Amino acid sequence: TVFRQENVDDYYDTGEELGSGQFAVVKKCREKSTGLQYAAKFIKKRRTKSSRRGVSREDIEREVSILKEIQHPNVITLHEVYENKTDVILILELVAGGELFDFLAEKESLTEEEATEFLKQILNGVYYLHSLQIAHFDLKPENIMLLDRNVPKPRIKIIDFGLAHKIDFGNEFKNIFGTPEFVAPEIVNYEPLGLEADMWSIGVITYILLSGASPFLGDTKQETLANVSAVNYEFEDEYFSNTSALAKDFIRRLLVKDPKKRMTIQDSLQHPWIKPPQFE
Numbered sequence: 001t002v003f004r005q006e007n008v009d010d011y012y013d014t015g016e017e018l019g020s021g022q023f024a025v026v027k028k029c030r031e032k033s034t035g036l037q038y039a040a041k042f043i044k045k046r047r048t049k050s051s052r053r054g055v056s057r058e059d060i061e062r063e064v065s066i067l068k069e070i071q072h073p074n075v076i077t078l079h080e081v082y083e084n085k086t087d088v089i090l091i092l093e094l095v096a097g098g099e100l101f102d103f104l105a106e107k108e109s110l111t112e113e114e115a116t117e118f119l120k121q122i123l124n125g126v127y128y129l130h131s132l133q134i135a136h137f138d139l140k141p142e143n144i145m146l147l148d149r150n151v152p153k154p155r156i157k158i159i160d161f162g163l164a165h166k167i168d169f170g171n172e173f174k175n176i177f178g179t180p181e182f183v184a185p186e187i188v189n190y191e192p193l194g195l196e197a198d199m200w201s202i203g204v205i206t207y208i209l210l211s212g213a214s215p216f217l218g219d220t221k222q223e224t225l226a227n228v229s230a231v232n233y234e235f236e237d238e239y240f241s242n243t244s245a246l247a248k249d250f251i252r253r254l255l256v257k258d259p260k261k262r263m264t265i266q267d268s269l270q271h272p273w274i275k276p277p278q279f280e
């Protein structure tokens with residue numbers, strides 16, 4: 001699939017940087033014709049077939065195909081796609097209130113209600129994606145951004161669909177590995193992956209939202225990964241002493257090694273607490 005090959009600078013003006021990653025940079029931008037504001041994600045292309053720098057065309061096309069399908073209040077929307085010899089440029093919905101990661105750092109510890117306010121939105125976005133047989137494969141606080149960080153109950157959107165895959169056969173068996181702290185055991189063990197991996201990541205996020213601590217984090221990536229595979233976590237009383245037993249029950253049903261025994265997204269929404277890269 002080919003994208004628009006006009007110079008993006010003919011149609012948009014760029015401003016402040018919103019994000020920076022291994023093969024991408026994100027710039028705030030403004031469309032000249034409408035005055036509306038977006039986030040332009042510049043993804044570096046591969047220069048050769050055998051190269052390790054940049055993103056393969058297959059991977060870029062996969063991400064764009066997924067983004068084109070999605071429209072939901074808790075997921076990002078894709079506006080347009082440009083390309084040139086060096087980059088594919090995704091013009092995405094602007095989410096200007098920063099990462100949930102940075103919000104959690106700056107704020108004192110969350111209450112269970114503040115945590116569930118966030119978590120219910122995440123669950124709603126993931127329910128949409130999973131209904132579509134889309135696995136995100138990179139859920140973590142850095143990939144959730146707030147629309148406005150200065151309201152009591154911030155609204156969120158899931159971003160960063162660079163690892164997302166359609167799961168039409170119940171699992172996929174590809175080169176898929178996210179951030180060690182957040183990956184499921186089946187990722188660590190290079191086993192076939194499905195929608196269940198996301199549910200593990202939600203359990204890790206939930207743990208962090210309630211405690212400010214990462215459940216599997218070691219001093220090195222390898223130690224983290226070993227901890228994940230062994231399901232080596234516990235609820236430290238220093239952090240969880242005034243956290244409800246039901247909240248812990250929720251996390252325990254997601255941090256399950258066997259993906260078939262893990263709560264699904266639908267189970268998570270009916271749970272009584274809710275119901276109303278890899279190498280150093």
Ligand SMILES: CN1CCN(c2cc(-c3ccncc3)cnn2)CC1
Binds near residue numbers: 019026094095160
């Ligand atoms: C781990 N990620 C990688 C780089 N970041 C981004 C940010 C955005 C974005 C989208 C809409 N409004 C603002 C920012 C899109 N893609 N990546 C954040 C941290």
